[PDB]
Design a protein around this nucleic acid. Structure first.
Ligand code: MG
Ligand code: MG
Ligand code: MG
Ligand code: MG
Ligand code: MG
Ligand code: MG
Ligand code: MG
Ligand code: MG
Ligand code: MG
Lengths: 147, 114, 171, 48, 183, 51
RNA sequence: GCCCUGAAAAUGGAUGGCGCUCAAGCGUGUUACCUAUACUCUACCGUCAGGGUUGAUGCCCUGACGAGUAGGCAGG
RNA sequence: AAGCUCGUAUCAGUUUUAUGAGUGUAAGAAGUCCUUGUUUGAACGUGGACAUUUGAAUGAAGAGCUUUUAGUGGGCCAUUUUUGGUAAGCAGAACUGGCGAUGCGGGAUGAACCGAACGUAGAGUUAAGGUGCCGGAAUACACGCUCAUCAGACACCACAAAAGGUGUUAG
RNA sequence: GGAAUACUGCCAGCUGGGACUGAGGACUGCGACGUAAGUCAAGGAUGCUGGCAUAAUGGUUAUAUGCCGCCCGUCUUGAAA
């Protein structure tokens, strides 16, 4: 016998794998697992962690929020990255020309960004363009606003 | 002898509640007559806060932080001196060490059998 | 165990403006030096007002027997603990060594007086120089001139289960 | 209770503005109120 | 030390040697029916199972812990041969929270090279002479997992004091014989 | 894959301690001490023989 | 100190039994010996943990752990 | 069980030091220095600055904050403090252990006694208890005591008046 | 006065007998003996030989011997009671 100081067979946890069955989402998880292992890039770590979250923990990000984020000084030419859905917003009348990478775009938000003159790309295209996440700005949506 | 809220005091009687002898608490209530003392008491596997009301003569100022304040001042002075003159300085307290060797001489001190 | 005799010399720890404390020496019978130092501190606290945490051990030295091959008569003065109080006892042991005499006394106390090592105190062991000073009959009977005695009814030890001859107890 | 060296504070007093009051003073006030109530009852009986 | 003892005897004095700075402690009782304070002290000294041993630096803070756990341990003053054999045969390092055998000097150099310790002999030196990095070296050493004594405990009943014919307490220099038997 | 005891395996002993070869060659495990003629004091002898 | 008396009922029975008297009884000392799912070393199963990896919720390397009613989770 | 953060982070049924009582408190960013503003002193502050010799030992890789829900609750025994006692048992408080949910070795047999906590095996060594035979293991060695017309091999309480005896041994 | 021996301890001194185990599966590493190429007991067993080639080993089944094993479920502190 031994007088254990701590619990035995304790799981670390930390959301090892996603609960989804989307084959494309699993492919993205595979690509960013490879990137996070073989780059030592904190951006890749953050994107890999965000790809494991549930729907209620991945709230949508508005195009008006994207515009407010781009209004920051020195960020007018950075690539906005949202691990989730980008929704449209009719409360804003001027939208800048920018590149946005996201899991999903609504039809209105995609039309608004393309009409402003930028491009909507996916996470694999983002990985090809910036393998270490150079000049990227990760945005998260509001959490407690829902109940 | 004026007691204020937040002072650390010792409970010392000059019959009931004999458990509160030697206990140390924090002053929270001061009146013209009595003093209120916070006591953290062990119940089961947790600590609970209790309000005690005492006469003025049955408490006194506690000096439990006096060594801490004096040591802080001495450490500041020694650190200033060692910054003025470059020297390796040890500031942490150390436990009592085992003693070194010695020679004991029987010069007039011849051992006596008892 | 097999007893050994030690001298233990100790003292109080030297203090400020009171240097060179007086040395105290005891002769202790024990099986090893750890037990000897424990007995020394016990007796020092019992007699003087000196504690182990306040004192120190200056020296401990084994004392050998001067003539271990010379048969001697010993008077042993001891005292033991009791509810009534401390009682003296004097015994006489014929032996060739102080430590073996002490071991014989301890065995005799364990057999007769139902006593224990921690409860028995060895106060003094003195060789009786003159045969006229021996005053116990069970020792005096072995001091007679031209002492002879047989050993009747000898029992031999067999290493085998069965013997083919009836045994004899002759000697 | 007035001469008692140490009085534990009741749990039910907390949450009200009467927490700062000396419990010895509170009990003396309650005793005097009881005595005056007895005197008023005696006066009522004498009136009746 | 030998010549200082002789020179003191020639001059009529007594040479008092320095107190031991190091002890070795072996847990002798099992994990059932241990009172809470000695149980906590045994956990703090990393004696979590029977026949587990560790080195302890002797200070006023550690003497009281040893006094608290006296009925459940056997401890004493180890010698150089005992320490060398313990480290050579049953020495394991704690690397990334794992128990790693010390079969090469490169392991010790990679894990304790910042303190100036480059080999198993340097580790033994830091143990035997309680140096500036004794705490780090001792905590690097995994607690020693000793077997039962090969010749037995030498007594009929273990759980009396060593003075009173038992096995626990401070046995000083006899801990070397006991630990070499258990090694 | 397997722990080898330097107290028994001479190759592992030499791998862990290069000075072991010098120790064995110089026979430092049986080093003779220098003979000296120091005598104890009469006070020490009398105290040792004292009752 | 040991021994005897120092009160006992009622089917036939108990230091566990046999039996034992310089003991196989009592006090003590020194050794040797016997053996637990305990300790030490090794192998194997599973769990957990830490690393590596362009049938990848797979593969490789290393380390430590394993009692269980109500109840919980997981794989079959 | 989920999230968020932080991770020389957060601490600890332990000790030490200082200070109380006949076990309590304290041991640094919820700091410190200068500079002199608030109602010649306490108490609140303006601006600048010192770190991996950031303030005892030992140990520890997970800690903190929000949400979130299954089973349960008046049990026995023992040890230590303390108050009242009875023919005698004991009765009322405080704390801590063992057991229920737990097998294994030993005590012949067993709810709380001794040892020890449990994956499947091999080898070695032991614990507690033992080694005349049942029965694995010395009818070992050594020093003494005892003879019981149902000794003893016992729990250490009672019978028990430390009473009776021309039993024996040592004081 | 000159020794020896006992006791305790140390050796990176030498050497004999016995038992259990052989995980891993190209190489890599740390070392040793060697001027040298190489060799080795150094990051886990190989070499040589005999008999049998089938009920011989082994499995299954019926029984014998040594030791261990109380009748389950439920409900009650707790149950052989
Ligand atoms: Mg286990
Ligand atoms: Mg053996
Ligand atoms: Mg035993
Ligand atoms: Mg028997
Ligand atoms: Mg006997
Ligand atoms: Mg037999
Ligand atoms: Mg009766
Ligand atoms: Mg067969
Ligand atoms: Mg049976």
């Amino acid at each position: 016998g031994i007088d254990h100081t701590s619990k035995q067979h304790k799981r670390s946890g930390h959301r090892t794998a996603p609960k989804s069955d989307n084959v494309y989402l699993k492919l993205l998880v595979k690509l960013y697992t490879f990137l996070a292992r073989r780059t030592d890039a904190p951006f890749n770590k953050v994107v890999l962690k965000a790809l494991f979250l549930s729907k209620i923990n991945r709230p949508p990000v508005s195009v008006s929020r994207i515009a407010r984020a781009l209004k920051q000084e020195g960020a007018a030419n950075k690539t906005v990255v949202v691990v989730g859905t980008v929704t449209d917003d009719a409360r804003i009348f001027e939208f800048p020309k920018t590149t946005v990478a996201a899991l999903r775009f609504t039809a209105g938000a995609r039309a608004k960004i393309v009409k402003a003159g930028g491009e909507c790309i996916t996470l694999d295209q983002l990985a090809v363009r910036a393998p270490k996440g150079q000049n990227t700005l990760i945005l998260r949506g509001p959490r407690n606003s829902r109940e | 002898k004026v007691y204020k809220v937040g002072d650390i005091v010792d409970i010392k009687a000059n019959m009931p509640h004999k458990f509160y002898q030697g206990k140390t608490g924090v002053v929270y209530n001061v009146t013209k007559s009595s003093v209120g003392v916070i006591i953290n008491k062990m119940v089961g596997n947790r600590y609970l806060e209790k309000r005690l009301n005492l006469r003025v003569e049955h408490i006194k100022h506690s000096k439990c932080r006096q060594e801490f304040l004096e040591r802080v001042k001495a450490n500041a002075a020694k650190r200033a001196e060692a910054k003025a003159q470059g020297v390796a300085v040890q500031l942490k307290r150390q436990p009592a060490q085992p003693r070194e060797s010695r020679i004991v001489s029987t010069e007039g001190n011849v051992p006596q059998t008892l | 165990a097999h007893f050994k005799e030690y001298q233990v010399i100790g003292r109080r720890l030297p203090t400020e403006s009171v240097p060179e404390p007086k040395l105290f020496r005891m002769r202790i019978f024990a099986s090893n030096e750890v037990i000897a130092k424990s007995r020394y501190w016990y007796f020092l606290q019992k007699l003087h007002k000196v504690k182990k945490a306040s004192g120190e051990i200056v020296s401990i030295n084994q004392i050998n027997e001067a003539h271990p091959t010379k048969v001697k008569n010993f008077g042993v003065w001891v005292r033991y603990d009791s509810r009534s109080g401390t009682h003296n006892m004097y015994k006489e042991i014929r032996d060739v060594s102080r430590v073996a005499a002490v071991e014989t006394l301890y065995q005799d106390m364990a057999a007769r007086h139902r006593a224990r090592f921690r409860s028995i105190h060895i106060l003094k062991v003195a060789e009786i120089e003159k045969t006229a000073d021996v005053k116990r009959q069970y020792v005096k009977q072995f001091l007679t001139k031209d002492l002879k005695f047989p050993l009747p009814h000898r029992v031999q030890k067999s290493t085998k289960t069965f013997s083919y001859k009836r045994p004899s107890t002759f000697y | 209770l007035d001469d008692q060296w140490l009085v534990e504070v009741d749990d039910k007093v907390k949450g009200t503005d009467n927490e700062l009051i000396d419990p010895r003073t509170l009990n003396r006030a309650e005793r005097k109120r009881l005595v005056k109530k007895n005197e008023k009852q005696q006066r009522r009986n004498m009136k009746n | 030390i030998i010549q200082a003892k002789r020179d003191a005897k020639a001059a009529g004095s007594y040479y008092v040697e320095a107190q031991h700075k190091l002890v070795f402690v072996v847990r002798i009782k099992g994990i059932n029916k241990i009172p809470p304070k000695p149980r906590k002290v045994l956990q703090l000294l990393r004696l979590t199972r029977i026949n587990s041993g560790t080195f302890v630096k002797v200070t006023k803070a550690t003497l009281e812990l040893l006094k608290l756990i006296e009925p459940y341990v056997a401890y004493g003053y180890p010698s150089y041969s005992t320490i060398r054999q313990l480290v050579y045969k049953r020495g394991f390092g704690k690397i990334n929270k794992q128990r790693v055998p010390l079969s090469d000097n490169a392991i010790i150099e990679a894990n304790l090279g910042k303190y100036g310790i480059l080999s198993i002999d340097d580790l033994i030196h830091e143990i035997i002479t309680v140096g500036p990095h004794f705490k780090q070296a001792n905590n690097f050493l995994w607690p020693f997992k000793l077997s039962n004594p090969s010749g037995g405990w030498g007594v009929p009943r273990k759980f009396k004091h060593f003075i009173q014919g038992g096995s626990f307490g401070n046995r000083e220099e006899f801990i070397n014989k006991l630990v070499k038997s258990m090694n | 894959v397997l722990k080898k005891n330097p107290l028994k395996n001479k190759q592992v002993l030499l791998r862990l301690n290069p000075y072991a070869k010098v120790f064995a060659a110089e026979k430092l495990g049986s080093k003779k001490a220098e003979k000296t003629g120091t005598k104890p004091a009469a006070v020490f002898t009398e105290t040792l023989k004292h009752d």
